[PDB]
């Protein structure tokens, strides 16, 4: 069926909004898919028109071949514009538009159009009537029935066609004879119609009006009844709705559910969409389940929830209400599905899998709010426990699958991310993803090994770096300094606190109307990038700060304070114990906040595609010189540095030009200052521990001013830089904290310590014991400098340890942490069940324990390799990918070449309704579909087969020339190895990513993915046939999305309130979790084949079950637009994975504390620690820090809105659930 022009038709339909099927079938009839068609009349083209249409309205502004030749993209786009104009001009009647297009208009057209208008199909010409008839299916018209009155239909009963046509007078014959299959369902035309207030991106004046006059901007998103005519009415309606809902909450659903969600048997499925409800007046005190009830808390700890961010107990309440609604509804869903299945097989008990956790969650929350007697706690008598994952004992319950019970009787269900049994088993059976990590050694073990004895030097370095917890030496005056370990722990703690501060500030910033209310301007990660970039630019140029909204102002203040503190610690690393510690900071006397200079790999790649190497270097140098000549402060500091460097009283401009060129060479001809996470991933040799990249990227110029390149287009060094403080601030912190620790503990730099340790190794090369000690010391240096790599799994194990500690001491925080973790587990397990039911490939092959086919294994190898290659070659900056996707549209190109007014990309961008409406699900599906396309293209190229995307039209959809595609083929052949089995490997990894053709490969895959897989509004089985394992998975996910949008609840909800934002949130959460689970399943099947034959069945059964797939989903969900990473908010210290005299010593020591943190009450919303606060901070993380980190980290997994929980629940209900089996 496809004929190489499908992407062109799809884009020409999204732009100039018109039916894709209409344009495609017009191509069918007119030309039967040939670009130049020989016609006796004379018209020659894809759409077969010379006539006057051609010049017409289309050109005469550009050099046009026209009547002779037409560019196929231009021809299709112009014809699509004409058809859209006709369709609109004829109201929505596509058949009259098709008649006008085929028969023309005026000379013979208008009489036939009028004849159409009065019924009168007899007056319409025979050819036009046949043309309309062959367009009947794809075209929608009020006149379709009248034309029908003026066959490959699936048989209702009996034999096909004749049996039901010539006969079957009985009803079924009538139903068949009146059928008329449509084949014309458009999800955004029929199901989700873009309203006026969706898709409408605010102007600055509208944005300011909304910011000033709208109390809660989320009420802008709902459009109940008729659409308000003007923004003032929308604002009025939003405010009235907000006041009404705030008033209603006092007796609303929160208050009604505050007593007995599941003790009362509340069924959330029979519920109105509960839009206004934000969990608020929701304190679940179930009367009964409150046996004992002290009004006074036992300690000053406990009392309330110990979170330290403002708005706590309220976002927690929203998460709790959403989780209770979801869990009760999922229990109801499971019971109903069990009843439906018992109809078929009465002798099958099935398992609820939700009502146990939900009952215990109600009991815990009830006791938490009532302060006493958790009734969910089990009777621990006759329990031997035994079995410790991280020193936490547990008993497996035979009654509940997985679901261990803790020391106090607290029972953690399976799929609870923190329970020790699931964590342990996930560690034992984890698909390829298990790595070296930090399992080598920890600070406590290295202290015992190296502070132990045998050398004066080894012990000297150990005393400087590592601290002994308990030692036989017990040095009375071992060191009056911090030591590198303590500095590292202190810096980790302060960084974590400021990360939670930044997370809260960024959430508030990116909830503002610019990104949340109107039509979706940008993806979530792109809003995050824009806000971080605004903060960074305002930091560098303070005049931009008046342009920040108060929330972005808070964000910028947090980031500025963090970077100022880091600079202060590098400049004065003697602020710790060591007095001979001096200024690890690269270039002092440059007095200003240093936001790290890190340059995008792909920005440099683009600036090398033109102006290859010397061009980009000259551009960087010349922009720096623009800064130098423009601003006298830059000139002053650069002149001072050059005078000091060359020892000359005067500086000639040749000197500063040479300096700028030498510094720009480091960016242009080296990848040291780029993202380059992969080279840091390598650990051997201690080569990269020297030469911190963040500090060497420092220069005295300003990257702000732009220089025009030889083609006249403007480039500034800021265009290269990577903002977003999501990969940038954490990595900068890792490196600089390592450097600060090394200098504050040892007077020496990282380089000097590296050389001295290598000298010790070379000296004691003979002794095995000494060699092991030196290797432990090297491991300490790797941990300090951040080489390490803790992995994702430290999050849940750290949470388990901290929650155990809370259970010992802070009861209310303990129970709240259990509640939030249980809610996360139920969310993810419900997702696993529903999507295992719904998506076909998942249940049929990947969620099943049975091993897959050999061809299926090859497809899985291709898919996982495609994901890996995407990770290597994907542009990290969200701006780069958004502009790359938008710019390739015809509108931007035509405006850039012909237009006299500048316009802007993202203003002329066509944009799929999938992006405008339902943006988050769209981004997840683009990412996964592009990875699938990469895998398919690579596998086909290495195999030698020709992809469907090698064809000219889909290449024209991207900017892929004939030549570029051949270059892509050569690149894949050059850097990729075809394994003996389906296994795929890369050669040199780094060199492959450095190839310029890698960007062409990525662009090809991404644009093909968009055009073919995600852009169309229709999903079909034939569509799923073409793609590979990942492609089929994500097409079935897109089909699942469309099914959900057509579900009764979701359809009714959109009719009542519109509010595509809520549906987008729900479907994006579902898609994230499901793709995580699917990737886990594919990697598990691959690892199973990695095992020998007898072990494959046991391993697949053990590693492919709802608990482990659910734990993978929580661990590896993407969370694309998340401010900071979930590891950063809660992450253990790298080195720190794990009688009364020392007690009394610690007591008498802390008896004296008089730092301002102890004296003063903590700030509400922003610590804003300076160097004094960092130095005076404890190394151990306080329970407030852990608890706020847990709440922030689960804010991504566990949504705060009860409405999105209800929407996810109803999507699952319409989908169905597996229900386990037997026990």
């Amino acid at each position: 069926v496809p004929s190489d022009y499908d992407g062109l038709f799809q884009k020409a339909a999204d732009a100039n909004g018109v039916s894709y099927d209409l344009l495609r079938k017009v191509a069918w009839t007119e030309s039967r898919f040939v670009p130049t068609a020989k016609s006796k009349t004379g018209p020659l083209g894809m759409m077969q028109f010379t006539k006057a249409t051609a010049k017409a309205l289309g050109l005469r502004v550009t050099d046009g071949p026209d009547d002779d030749r037409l560019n196929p993209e231009l021809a299709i786009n112009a014809a699509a514009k004409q058809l859209a104009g006709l369709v609109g001009k004829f109201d929505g009647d596509e058949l009259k538009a098709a008649l006008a297009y085929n028969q023309g208009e005026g000379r013979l057209g208008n009489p036939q159009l009028e004849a159409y208008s009065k019924g009168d199909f007899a007056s319409i010409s025979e050819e036009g009537r046949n043309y309309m008839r062959n367009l009947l299916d794809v075209a929608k018209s009020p006149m379709a029935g009248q034309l029908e009155t003026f066959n490959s239909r699936s048989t209702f009963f009996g034999f096909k066609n004749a049996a039901e046509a010539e006969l079957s007078n009985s009803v079924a014959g009538m139903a068949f004879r009146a059928g008329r299959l449509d084949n014309g369902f458009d999800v955004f035309k029929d199901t989700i119609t873009p309203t006026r207030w969706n898709s409408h991106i605010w102007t600055p004046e509208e944005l300011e009006k909304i910011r000033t006059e709208v109390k809660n901007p989320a009420y802008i998103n709902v459009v109940t009844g008729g659409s308000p005519e003007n923004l003032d009415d929308l604002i009025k309606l939003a405010n009235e709705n907000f006041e009404n809902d705030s008033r209603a909450a006092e007796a609303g659903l929160g208050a009604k559910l505050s007593a007995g969600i599941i003790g009362a048997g509340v069924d959330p499925l029979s519920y109105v969409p509960m839009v206004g409800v934000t969990g608020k007046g929701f304190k679940l005190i179930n009367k009964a389940l409150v046996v004992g009830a002290e009004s006074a808390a036992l300690n000053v700890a406990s009392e309330g929830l110990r979170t330290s961010v403002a708005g706590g107990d309220a976002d927690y309440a929203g998460a709790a209400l959403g989780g209770f609604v979801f869990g009760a509804g999922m229990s109801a869903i499971s019971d109903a599905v069990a009843a439906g299945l018992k109809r078929s097989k009465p002798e099958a008990e099935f398992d609820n899998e939700f009502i146990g956790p939900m009952m215990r969650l109600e009991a815990r929350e009830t006791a938490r709010n009532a302060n006493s007697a958790d009734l969910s706690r089990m009777n621990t008598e006759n329990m031997k426990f035994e079995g410790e994952h991280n020193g936490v004992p547990y008993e497996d319950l035979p009654t509940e699958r997985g679901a261990v019970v803790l020391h106090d009787g607290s029972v953690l269900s399976a799929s609870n991310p923190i329970n020790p049994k699931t964590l342990k088993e996930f560690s034992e059976v984890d698909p390829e993803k298990a790595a070296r990590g930090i399992k080598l050694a920890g600070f406590t073990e290295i202290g015992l090994k190296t502070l132990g004895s045998d050398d004066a030097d080894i012990r000297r370095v150990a005393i400087d770096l590592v601290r002994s917890p308990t030692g036989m030496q017990s040095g009375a005056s071992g060191k009056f300094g911090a030591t590198a370990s303590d500095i590292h722990e202190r810096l980790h703690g302060t960084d974590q606190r400021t990360y939670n501060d930044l997370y809260k500030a960024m959430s508030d910033a990116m909830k503002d109307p610019e990104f949340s209310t109107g039509g979706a301007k940008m993806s979530r990660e792109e809003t995050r990038y824009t806000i971080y970039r605004r903060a960074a630019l305002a930091i560098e140029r303070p005049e931009l700060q008046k342009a920040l909204t108060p929330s972005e102002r808070i964000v910028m203040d947090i980031i500025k304070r963090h970077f100022d503190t880091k600079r202060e610690l590098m400049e004065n690393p003697a602020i710790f114990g060591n007095t001979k510690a001096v200024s690890i900071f690269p270039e002092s006397r440059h007095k200003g906040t240093y936001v790290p200079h890190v340059y995008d790999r792909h920005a440099k790649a683009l600036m090398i595609q033109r102006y290859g190497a010397e061009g980009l270097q000259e551009g960087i140098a010349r922009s720096w010189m623009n800064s130098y000549v423009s601003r006298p402060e830059v000139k002053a500091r650069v002149d001072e540095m050059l005078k000091e460097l060359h020892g000359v009283k005067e500086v000639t401009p040749e000197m500063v030009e040479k300096y700028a060129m030498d510094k720009a060479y480091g960016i242009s001809h080296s990848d040291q200052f780029t993202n380059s996470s992969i080279i840091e991933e390598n650990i051997e040799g201690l080569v990269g521990i020297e030469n911190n990249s963040f500090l060497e990227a420092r220069n005295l110029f300003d990257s702000d001013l732009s220089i025009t390149m030889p083609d006249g287009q403007q480039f500034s060094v800021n265009d290269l830089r990577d903002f977003d403080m999501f990969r940038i601030m954490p990595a900068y912190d890792r490196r600089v904290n390592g450097d600060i620790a090394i200098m504050g503990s040892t007077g020496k730099t990282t380089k000097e310590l590296k050389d001295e340790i290598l000298a010790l190794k070379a000296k004691a090369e003979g002794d095995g014991k000494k060699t092991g000690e030196v290797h432990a010391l090297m491991d300490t240096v790797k941990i300090l400098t951040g080489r390490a790599r803790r992995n994702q799994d430290t999050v849940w194990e750290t949470s388990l340890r901290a929650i155990n500690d809370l259970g010992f001491f802070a009861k209310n925080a303990y129970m709240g942490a259990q509640n939030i973790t249980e809610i996360a587990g139920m969310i993810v397990t419900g997702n696993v069940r529903a999507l295992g039911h719904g998506i076909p490939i998942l249940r049929d092959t990947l969620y099943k324990s049975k091993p897959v086919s050999a061809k299926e294994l090859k497809e899985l190898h291709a898919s996982l390799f495609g994901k890996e290659v995407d990770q290597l070659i994907r542009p990290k900056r969200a701006d780069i990918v958004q502009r790359l996707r938008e710019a390739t549209d015809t509108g931007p190109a035509v405006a850039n070449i012909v237009g006299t007014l500048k316009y802007s990309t993202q203003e002329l961008a066509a944009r799929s309704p999938w992006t405008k409406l339902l943006n988050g699900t769209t981004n997840y599906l683009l990412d996964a579909a592009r990875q699938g396309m990469l895998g398919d293209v690579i596998s086909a190229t290495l195999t030698g087969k020709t992809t469907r995307w090698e064809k000219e039209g889909f290449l024209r959809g991207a900017s892929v020339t004939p030549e570029q595609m051949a270059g892509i083929k050569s690149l894949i052949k050059e850097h990729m190895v075809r394994g003996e089995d389906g296994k795929f490997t890369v050669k040199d990894k780094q060199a492959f990513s450095m190839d310029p053709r890698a960007m062409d490969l990525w662009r090809l895959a991404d644009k093909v993915a968009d055009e073919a897989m995600l852009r169309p509004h229709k999903v079909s089985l034939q569509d799923s046939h073409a793609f590979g394992a990942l492609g089929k998975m994500v097409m079935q996910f897109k089909s699942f999305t469309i099914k959900s949008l057509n579900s009764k609840f979701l359809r009714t909800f959109y009719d009542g309130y519109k509010n595509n934002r809520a549906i987008d949130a729900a479907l994006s959460i579902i898609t994230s979790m499901g793709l995580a689970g699917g990737f886990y399943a594919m990697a598990a099947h691959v690892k199973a084949y990695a095992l020998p034959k007898e072990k494959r069945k046991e391993y697949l059964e053990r590693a492919l079950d709802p608990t482990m797939i659910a734990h993978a989903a929580l661990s590896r969900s993407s969370q694309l637009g998340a401010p900071l990473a979930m590891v950063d908010l809660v992450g253990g210290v790298l080195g720190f994975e794990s009688t009364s005299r020392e007690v009394m010593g610690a007591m008498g020591s802390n008896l004296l504390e008089q730092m301002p943190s102890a004296g003063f009450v903590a700030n509400v919303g922003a610590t804003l620690m300076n160097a004094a606060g960092v130095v005076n901070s404890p190394n151990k993380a306080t329970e407030q820090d852990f608890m706020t980190g847990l709440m922030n980290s689960t804010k991504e997994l566990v949504p705060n809105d009860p409405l999105t929980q209800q929407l996810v629940l109803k999507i699952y209900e319409a989908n169905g659930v597996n229900l386990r089996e037997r026990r």
Partner: peptide, 26 residues
């Protein structure tokens, strides 16, 4: 329109057949 025409034609055929049956029984 299509439903009306289909049901009308079907009803004509059914009434024809029923009339034949009734006249046969008489």
């Amino acid at each position: 329109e299509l439903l009306s025409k289909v049901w009308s034609e079907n009803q004509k055929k059914l009434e024809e057949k029923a009339r034949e049956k009734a006249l046969a029984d008489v």
